[PDB]
Amino acid sequence: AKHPVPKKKTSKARRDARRSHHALTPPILVPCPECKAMKPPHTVCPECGYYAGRKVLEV
Amino acid sequence: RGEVAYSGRKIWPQKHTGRARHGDIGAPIFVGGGVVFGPKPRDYSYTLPKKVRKKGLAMAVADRAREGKLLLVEAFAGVNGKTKEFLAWAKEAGLDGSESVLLVTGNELVRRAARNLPWVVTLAPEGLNVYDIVRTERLVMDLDAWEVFQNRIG
Amino acid sequence: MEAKAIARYVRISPRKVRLVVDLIRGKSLEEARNILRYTNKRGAYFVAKVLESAAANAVNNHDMLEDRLYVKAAYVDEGPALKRVLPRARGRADIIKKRTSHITVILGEKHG
Amino acid sequence: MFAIVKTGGKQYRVEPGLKLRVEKLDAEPGATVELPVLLLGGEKTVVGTPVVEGASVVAEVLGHGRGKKILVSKFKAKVQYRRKKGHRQPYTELLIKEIRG
Amino acid sequence: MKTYVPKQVEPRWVLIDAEGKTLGRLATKIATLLRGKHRPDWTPNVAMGDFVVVVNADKIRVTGKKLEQKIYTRYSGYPGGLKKIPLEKMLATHPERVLEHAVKGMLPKGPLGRRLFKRLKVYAGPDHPHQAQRPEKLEV
Amino acid sequence: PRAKTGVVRRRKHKKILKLAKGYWGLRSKSFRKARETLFAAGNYAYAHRKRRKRDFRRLWIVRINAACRQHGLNYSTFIHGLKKAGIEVDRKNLADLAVREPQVFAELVERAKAAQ
RNA sequence: AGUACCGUGAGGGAAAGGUGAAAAGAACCCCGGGAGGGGAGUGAAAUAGAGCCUGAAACCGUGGGCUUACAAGCAGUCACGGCCCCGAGGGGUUGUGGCGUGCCUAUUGAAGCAUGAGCCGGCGACUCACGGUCGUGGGCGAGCUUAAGCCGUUGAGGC
RNA sequence: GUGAGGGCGCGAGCGAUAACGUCCGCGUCCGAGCGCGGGAACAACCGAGACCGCCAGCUAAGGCCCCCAAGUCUGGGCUAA
RNA sequence: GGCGGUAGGGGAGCGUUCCCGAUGCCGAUGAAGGCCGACCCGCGAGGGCGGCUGGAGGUAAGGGAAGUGCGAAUGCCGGCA
């Protein structure tokens, strides 16, 4: 290895075009069928402690 | 660069450093270093030919005479070292203060009375010069001052 | 009417918090609230604090209804840098820039 | 009815009531001048050889002016030769009064 | 006075029979027609040429021994990927491509030249499908 | 007395950067790249305002040629006919007649044919 | 400040000034753990709020207009067209066509696969003394001129 | 200031009737005309010495079937490669 | 009638700092500086003018004197890519 190195400073255009795929995707949330609170699917509701229509965890 | 207050050590080696070659930080290429061809104490005085000075004095008084702004007086009535007395004397002699006057006389009392006016420049006769003459719009002199001026230009 | 809130000198990299700010711009206040709540990023905390301060400003200061609030503007600026020394091999000294952010959120009323 | 007139070294097609910038003319503003005709067209067609004899276009000089400044600049590489000149072409404004056949 | 720049006009459709004609001598005329240089309102920055339909391109003729000697070439980008096809095999496999290449090589390069080439329709055999456009038979 | 740079260099850099409005990237943002691009642009402008006359003349010739070939002859035949006839109507107005007043151009074509 | 920092040591040796006329330096309330901010309040002014006069440039961002996913480029220029703005005119933008080998330095010759430069801002290089030699503006002219000093001035000249 | 010249033509020498070789003479051009037209492109080959402007005209070399401005121009002959 | 131009010779101007002009003049009805302009004068360097910022200085005609104009020195210091 002979220490590869950038040949030219990247133009703002090129670095931002490279970053064109960096946008976050927003979370995935559904309403809990008990307290109607938005929560991730297939998780136990952290606002009421219910999942599959029963208590599992003290909230 | 020799007068600056730094040492003369080479900051880093000549070669194989990656930086640029340099000597000491007093070099004028550095910030805070010496200044190339900076001004030193000088003497801007020179000897102007004497006849040129004398002829220039003559010519300045001659210009003010040909203009009609020249006036000779014998004495100064009753001014004795007070600005108000000189203001009265000048009002009577036709000096309202709208033109700057060069008063030249041997009487110290008159020069003391007049020297604080914003439109009056006082001079002893032996100190007549072409600058102060061209400076002012009118020229007033003693008869003694006139005689010693004739004796200087002679 | 608008209601803005600014968190200045937030010790985090702008390019990092902007990623989360871009997630909530133009969204309704409740949408933005849940979105920030379940966003797996460090700047989610700070954007959430700024959004809540803005909503409080709106309600308690500019006569705006809570159920009418949305994120009209939302931008991060870059603040001063905390330059630290980082020792590398062979006696060389690097400088790490610990950046800082100025989060700004501006809310308005969505009539209708 | 139109007329191809020649002035300032160049030929323009004019019609009555047309404003036109041509090269500068030695003529006081508001005065009137006759422009030669090389070809008359429209209702009738007479072809100049090279001009037509008894035909002239009467136009009224509206005034004189200077055009939009052009920055003519010359640059010669590796030789430290650079030149900057501003140029404003003097013109005259004419309004075509009538076509005199 | 400025030079007249035409408004976008309706282009005219033109049909040409290639049968028995000389390849290049017809190709130059097809290209001129595609340019719009036969119209007195011609402009170089717009596409205003004709739509040229060609039939019986399979019956083009050519001088000399060019049947076995003219060699079209294609470099596929790989090592040794140089295809050399003679005119005979071309006429017997993709005969309209002969005229297509002869015309494409005579239009300007760039985007406008490409769309001008898109305005030409070459057809082997006597039949074409552009009966809807109703072309005008031209004796070039 | 000491005359430091002060205010001048910034004003000269701003003058050169104003002319650079519209250039790609640093060619409008860096004073030096701006200056280089402006050297190129100025030489381009001189040479191209020279070449524009030939450009337009060549277009005029193409149009006159199309109109002439609509009437039998070609461009060269037509210009020879004009030269012999005595007609000194330039090619700008000639194309303007070829498109705007085809009857006058047809009359010119007639005089050109007959003038040989 | 001969400080911090560097060095065993002799020794080297920085950066760093500015709110306002007056602290009148923001009580109290609101979100927040705090920081920070939002109202209130002070002020002629608070993008004068202490990270404080003026606040340029590179540089990072939000919004708006024009434009961009079949296209070959020292990135411009010339022409035409479309869209947007300000009211036979002009500005902004760029679709297509034409033309077009960065700058500096060094060389017989560089776009050059020869040198230098990431970019911006500030610092950065033909001077001074004395003598000489030409030319030039004056003064005097077979003459021209004083040096050190002395007197006077306190930016007055004279001897 | 320069006292590193270089290409081309002619006359020679050196070289192998070799070199974008080398050394002189006469000339020219580049250098400094890497400004313009031609020669596909190209300092020195051909045309020609760029004060600035014009949507005017005439020519030079070179060109006139398409790219590409102008003749698929006229008369005679040769070539089939 | 002349006016491509490297080395180089000469000519004419612009601008920066300071002094005489100035116990004057401009200035809170807004100084210098900063951000814009498609407006005017000048071939040009530049000078005007108008709007915004700025909050206290600036300085004519005509002369004088220099620490007087930056894009490169693997320049120097700082800031940010």
Ligand SMILES: NC(=[NH2+])NCCC[C@H](N)C(=O)O
């Ligand atoms: N009498 C005199 N020579 N006076 C000369 C000037 C005195 C003093 N410096 C003044 O102007 O008031």
Ligand SMILES: [Mg+2]
């Ligand atoms: Mg290895």
Ligand SMILES: [Mg+2]
């Ligand atoms: Mg590797």
Ligand SMILES: [Mg+2]
């Ligand atoms: Mg290894």
Ligand SMILES: [Mg+2]
């Ligand atoms: Mg590897």
Ligand SMILES: [Mg+2]
């Ligand atoms: Mg490595």
Ligand SMILES: [Mg+2]
């Ligand atoms: Mg960048």
Ligand SMILES: [Mg+2]
């Ligand atoms: Mg960019």
Ligand SMILES: [Mg+2]
């Ligand atoms: Mg990229």
Ligand SMILES: [Mg+2]
């Ligand atoms: Mg961007």
Ligand SMILES: [Mg+2]
């Ligand atoms: Mg709970």
Ligand SMILES: [Mg+2]
């Ligand atoms: Mg030193």
Ligand SMILES: [Mg+2]
């Ligand atoms: Mg020393």
Ligand SMILES: [Mg+2]
């Ligand atoms: Mg020392």
Ligand SMILES: [Mg+2]
């Ligand atoms: Mg020392």
Ligand SMILES: [Mg+2]
């Ligand atoms: Mg020391």
